[PDB]
Amino acid sequence: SRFLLKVLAANIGAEFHLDSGKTYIVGSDPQVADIVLSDMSISRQHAKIIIGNDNSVLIEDLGSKNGVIVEGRKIEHQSTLSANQVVALGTTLFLLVDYA
Numbered sequence: 231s232r233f234l235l236k237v238l239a240a241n242i243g244a245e246f247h248l249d250s251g252k253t254y255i256v257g258s259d260p261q262v263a264d265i266v267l268s269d270m271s272i273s274r275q276h277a278k279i280i281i282g283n284d285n286s287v288l289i290e291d292l293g294s295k296n297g298v299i300v301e302g303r304k305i306e307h308q309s310t311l312s313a314n315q316v317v318a319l320g321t322t323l324f325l326l327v328d329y330a
Contacts, residue, residue: 231285231330238316238323240269248326251283255292256319271296271320279311287311287326296320 235254237244246265248254257263259274273294280288289311291298298305299318311317313328 231328233281233287233313234327234329235265235279235324236327237267238325240322241267248279248281250281250285253278253280255279256324257292267319267322269320269322272322276319277317285328289317294319 233248235246235248254264255262255275256265256267256277256279257275258267258269258272260266262275273292275292276294277298278290278292280290282288287310288308289298289300289305290308291305300309300311301315311326313326315325317324
């Protein structure tokens with residue numbers, strides 16, 4: 231199955247295929263991040279998204295200033311991220327879609 235990260239709102243519209251078995255860093259600094267979002271409230275490197283080889287996703291906070299919020303809850307280090315779940319980084323919103 232095929233995951234994509236879509237930015238909802240900031241850098242609205244952006245969509246990126248996140249490969250199975252790969253890790254992607256989301257942040258504001260293009261020298262350290264793979265998905266670069268220009269919003270001041272996003273850490274240089276903020277969150278890491280790990281796509282396991284078996285249709286599972288993990289998200290991780292990289293010592294971000296403002297934290298990583300999934301569906302209203304601030305994750306305490308690293309958690310499961312499911313298709314269709316809103317993630318908030320600073321004032322930026324995104325989610326994963328899955329084409330199964």
